[PDB]
Amino acid sequence: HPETLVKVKDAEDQLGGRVGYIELDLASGKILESFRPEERFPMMSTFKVLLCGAVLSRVDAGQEQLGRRIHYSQNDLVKYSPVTEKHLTDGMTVGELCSAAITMSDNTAANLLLTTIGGPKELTAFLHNMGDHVTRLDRWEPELNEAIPNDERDTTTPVAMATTLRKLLTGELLTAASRQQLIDWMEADKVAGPLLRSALPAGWFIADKSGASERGSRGIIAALGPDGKPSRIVVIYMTGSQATMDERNRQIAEIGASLIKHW
Template sequence: MSSPIHRRHLLVGGAVALIGAAPGQEPVTEALRTLERRSGGRLGVGIVDTARGTSAGWRQHERFTQASSFKLSLAAMILAEAERGRLALTDVLRWPRDDLLPHSPVTAAAIAGSLPIRDLARAAVVTSDNTAANVLLRRIGGPARLTAFWRSTGDRISRLDRYEPALNVTPPGTSLDTTTPAAMAATVGRLLRGKVLQPASRTVLGDWMIAADTGRQRLRAGFPNDWRAGDKTGTGGAAGHPIFVDLAFGAPPGRAPLIVTAYFESPAAMASAEAEAVLAAVGRIAAGSAK
């Protein structure tokens, strides 16, 4: 049996080698198809090249669980609400200690059980703090309000139905808490480069993504070292059916960015590091398409 490291090289090298075989989207699609086949899982990818105005991907219009990647849009909505005067980023929100969830590094360290809204939004993106996300969701009126925010931006697909941690598993036969790679790639593009947010807020959101510390081994690991890049991850799925998610932007200096969304439902026996290596391979494929 191949070692995890050897398998990672096979996954990455074989798929990325297909890029450059011919111009256009076909090499990207074929590389992603090959990567999925070799991984043994289910892969969904959306790639938008904002410099060229082109898009590509694989299973772009199929639904995948968002897991914690929804927190990027949640933070964007918080910034948008502040711009419209519906809340102040300096307002302090409180939560009972009983509401603390696992993986809440920022809120768990808040001795008083309270933080300003801006700090909670940053924590939701940078550290994927679960308690911060739930506190913010309650402040804006619940998951349905985030879904309404997506609709207001032109996203007719993405939906949020529940709070952390229930939202990490989509029950069979439902589309709860899901999106598609194409829909979310378009949404991330609008949040970072469109008119949903004012320029100052777009800068803040992008800076939070750059500071995020949960996705260093995912899409960004496949981007060249000199690229300016940021991301927001998600990890969820039912027992035996894990999903690894990453939403990223990246570009070399002076170039408009690529927007990449990736959703990988990995085989149950695959180690987390191997699953993240699949997303890193997606990053390399996307970066190769931008040359």
């Protein structure tokens, strides 16, 4: 049961590639622990939380409504669309699309939402406008999942993502209702069980979003804490490894267990 930093390094030793890690105090924003904090990693589906943050900003400004219904066709479906593929007749509201993109990592949902705001480049422009010049989205789904060995497109760094996530969840950037909706969507995450959630004790709160792409990218962003209240932000990224999805999941769970047991 090695310290958190020791486990992250151990993970990198076992997996190959690089493992990036950061841990923020929620209340203050102070970095409590880090490793490769400022090195770039593929974002993968974790950008989907950022996307919905931009959507909710439009809502706060009366430029969008969570209830606005969006219809799409069979042509619009891309691979992995467990939710959108079920609503070709009735379509889905902007809010349902965010739920699908965040809680199931629905690709088409994310593409539809990107259209509503003006595309990948317009998310990046939203991020620049809030203080994040590091993170960048350049492509749609599923092209952004190729994690070209050290390519800067569709990347972030552990420190930028964690900082951006923290502003989204706790800053005056979104209204209280909107920022509660965002964390609510993350809390309802359904496809990250084998990650940090598998190491979570009873009564703990967590809201998270996972990602996975090409060779052998894997990541998770999270707000978590004991007593049903989030008190820290954790961001883990991985890339470069040849290991299976199982091993990469397992290593993240063991980093999680270390984080918990040394809380």
